[PDB]
A = this chain, B = another copy of it.
């Protein structure tokens, strides 16, 4: 009758192997570095397992032991020192918590660190070394993860997000805990299968053809044909052998049935597999007649690991007279400092962006006036308020350039309004974002143009990616 004992912790990030930006402890602190007891009373996509356990503890069926919850925004690989420090802190907490019955981790699945290409398996395997084989070890994962057979063997069960945009974190956690409970009570013996679709492909879960595949997977779980099923869309920017789109199926003591079901959903994904220049996109933009027009620099979306400091669209806007216009948020902490030292109303030259690496392009020399200075701009992201920090607006030839000291994407038009710019009255509103800007902008846009990279000539060189993989190379074998 003892309330089951359940360890919960979180360590994760979406590594862009091509980002020159580091993901150290500073980064985890900028987004999430909550040590035991510091986790707020609001849910996070990375801390789902803890939330449902807290809930089941209120229900009086669980005694949560909480460890460090760490998460960092998309960037380059984690430093060996940072990953090691957080990994060992969480593992020490698990030791001090012994004895436990269920261990449930919130992980991403695509965290790459220097010296570790299988970080999630390391943590889970180093966990079983302490808990033993009779404790239920499991983890929640982002569908943008890198699944390996090593990771599947490192845990009793792994449950991933079913939805992108990622909405189902708490519900997937409840599913994981339910399964981990049945595994502890010896009511279920998990048999698993991982199918490599030999492809890296991504589709939103709310539109066809993916909506029906995700639904059919939920139906198999409800009908009990599968204990749990996860479609791993993957993260193309992780240069690692485990990268790729995959399907993971678990069944109750029927591994052949897992392999068939996994193969069926994986071939449907392979079938759902469905050239553009920067200049053409700027020409298309110059042809727009319905304002406001939203220009999305998805190539420089910080939410995908980009630095958010490429100034090609800003340069193209001023050269092709795409004004009145606004652009942001651009990451140039030095430029924020210099604009602040100059003062509101100052007409001066500022070098903006082009500073982190080669994907940032050459900097833009702007002659303009400081038309805005804000000390702590924040935006509304799913109830939360992630900061832009000190922010500057410099206005040049009709372009209002918003520069931030904290790197982030644009989540709506209030970040520009904070600096005296009204995006609805603009001809063109350029955002460093991909799809999450649509949260706050709503119906403001009469047209949207996803802008291509100004550096399509610079090709990504992968060093550890599995070949053949789509769409990098043709795949002509499916039987081994």
Q: Are A341 and B24 in contact (CB under 8 A)?
A: yes
What residues of B have a CB within 8 angstroms of the CB of A77 in the complex?
342, 346, 348
A149-157, A199-207, A263-271, A349-357: which lies at the interface:
A349-357
Q: In the assembly, how many copies of this chain are there?
A: 2
Please, what's the 1-or-0 string for A321-357, where 1 marks a CB less than 8 Å from any CB in chain B? 0000000000001100110011101111111001111
A31-39, A215-223, A360-368, A444-452: which lies at the interface:
A360-368
Q: Which residues of A contact B (CB under 8 A)?
A: 20-24, 26, 76-77, 79-82, 114-115, 333-334, 337-338, 341-343, 345-351, 354-358, 360, 362-363, 365
What residues of B have a CB within 8 angstroms of the CB of A80 in the complex?
343, 345-346
Q: Are A343 and B20 in contact (CB under 8 A)?
A: no
What residues of B have a CB within 8 angstroms of the CB of A347 in the complex?
114
A370 shortest CB reach to chain B, Å: 9
Q: Are B114 and A341 in contact (CB under 8 A)?
A: no
A239 shortest CB reach to chain B, Å: 11
- For the complex with contacts A20-B350, A354-B354, 8 further pairs of A-B residues with Cβ separation under 8 Å are A21-B338, A22-B338, A22-B346, A76-B342, A114-B346, A350-B357, A351-B357, A354-B355
A440 shortest CB reach to chain B, Å: 28
What residues of B have a CB within 8 angstroms of the CB of A333 in the complex?
334
What residues of B have a CB within 8 angstroms of the CB of A358 in the complex?
349, 351, 365
Q: Are B79 and A20 in contact (CB under 8 A)?
A: no
Asked, given contacts A79-B342, A342-B79, A363-B355, whether A348 binds B22 with beta carbons under 8 Å apart, the answer is yes
What residues of B have a CB within 8 angstroms of the CB of A365 in the complex?
357-358
What residues of B have a CB within 8 angstroms of the CB of A23 in the complex?
341
Q: Are B360 and A362 in contact (CB under 8 A)?
A: no
What residues of B have a CB within 8 angstroms of the CB of A346 in the complex?
22, 77, 79-80, 114-115
Closest residue on chain B to residue A350 by CB atoms: B20
6 contacts between A and B (CB under 8 A): A77-B348, A114-B342, A349-B357, A349-B358, A351-B358, A362-B363
C-alpha gap A337/B334 in the complex (Å): 13
A378 shortest CB reach to chain B, Å: 23
Closest residue on chain B to residue A332 by CB atoms: B355
C-alpha gap A357/B364 in the complex (Å): 9
What residues of B have a CB within 8 angstroms of the CB of A337 in the complex?
22
A131 shortest CB reach to chain B, Å: 30
What residues of B have a CB within 8 angstroms of the CB of A350 in the complex?
20, 357
What residues of B have a CB within 8 angstroms of the CB of A115 in the complex?
345-346
Q: Are A345 and B22 in contact (CB under 8 A)?
A: no
C-alpha gap A347/B79 in the complex (Å): 11
A213 shortest CB reach to chain B, Å: 36
7 nearest A-B pairs in the assembled complex, by CB-CB distance: A22-B341, A114-B346, A79-B343, A22-B342, A24-B341, A355-B355, A358-B365
Asked, given contacts A348-B22, A362-B362, A363-B363, whether A355 binds B334 with beta carbons under 8 Å apart, the answer is yes
Closest residue on chain B to residue A333 by CB atoms: B334
A374 shortest CB reach to chain B, Å: 16
What residues of B have a CB within 8 angstroms of the CB of A343 in the complex?
22, 24, 79-82, 114
What residues of B have a CB within 8 angstroms of the CB of A349 in the complex?
20, 357-358
